[PDB]
Amino acid sequence: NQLTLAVASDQEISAHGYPTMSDAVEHFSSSASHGFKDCRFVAFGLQDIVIGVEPSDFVVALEGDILTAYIATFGARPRCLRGWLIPSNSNYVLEEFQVIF
Amino acid sequence: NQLTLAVASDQEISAHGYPTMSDAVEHFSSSASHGFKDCRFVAFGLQDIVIGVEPSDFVVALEGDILTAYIATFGARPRCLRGWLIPSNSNYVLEEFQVIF
């Protein structure tokens, strides 16, 4: 539930998603157990900073107002979408979040 | 891992989805445990049949070549997307699929 995430703090970041949903639950379960030390939070309003992730690529989406995390394409647009967790090594600032998995 | 699904066969498919991941999980979870009988399979390419479902609405998506099913917005477009299961009372024909979750 309580997570201190690495929020992207570069003007542009190099990132990547995954091609299929099965590669994503494979890859993101390791992240989820390692507190996402490898991912960066990108706010919905800052999506343009992300390079290397196509609309078809799977990332971790966050929705809510308390956030619910789930695997989704980067191009998907549900209401209440607040941001994504995206594999990246960008520079970051640590921020506390409340996340449901 | 071996499912009989109601494949939509009407000219127009009146249907609906769900506005948040949390709400979608609840319904589809009950729909899954009742064999998806309240749902219709809509092949990719026939989404213009569907009335009542917004791109932001959550439905069940099915991707693969053997399918894997997961909750996703109706508008999401991963590679190998084969179709959706969407709550609908449309006329149907029964067909055989292979599905994991």
Residue numbers in the entry:
A (entry chain B), B (entry chain A): 3 to 67, 69 to 104
List passages from the publication reporting this PDB structure.
Similar to β-CoV nsp1, α-CoV nsp1 has been identified as an important virulence factor that acts by inhibiting the host protein synthesis function. Here, we are the first to report a 1.8-Å full-length crystal structure for FIPV nsp1 and a 2.1-Å full-length crystal structure of SADS-CoV nsp1. The crystal structures of SADS-CoV nsp1 and FIPV nsp1 reveal that their monomers contain six antiparallel β-strands and two α-helices. The overall structure of α-CoVs nsp1 shared the same fold, with a characteristic six-stranded β-barrel formed by β1 relative to β6, β2 relative to β5, and β3 relative to β4.
As a newly discovered CoV, SADS-CoV broke out in 2017 in Guangdong Province, causing the death of approximately 25,000 piglets within a few months. The SADS-CoV nsp1 and FIPV nsp1 structures were refined to 2.1- and 1.8-Å resolutions, respectively. Their space groups are P212121 and C121, respectively. Each asymmetric unit of SADS-CoV nsp1 and the FIPV nap1 structures contained two and four subunits, respectively. With the exception of the regions encompassing amino acids 105 to 110 of SADS-CoV nsp1 and 106 to 110 of FIPV nsp1, all the residues of both nsp1 proteins can be built using the final models. Similarly, structure comparison showed that the overall structure of SADS-CoV nsp1 is conserved relative to that of PEDV nsp1 (with an RMSD of 0.84 Å), but it has several differences relative to TGEV nsp1 (with an RMSD of 1.89 Å). For SADS-CoV nsp1 and PEDV nsp1, the length of the β6 is significantly shorter in SADS-CoV nsp1. Additionally, there are also substantial differences in the loops, especially those located at residues 11 to 22 in SADS-CoV nsp1. Furthermore, the structures of α-CoV 1A nsp1s and α-CoV 1B nsp1s also exhibit obvious differences in some loops, especially those located at residues 52 to 59 in SADS-CoV nsp1. Specifically, SADS-CoV nsp1 and PEDV nsp1 have a wider distribution of negative charges on the surface than FIPV nsp1 and TGEV nsp1.
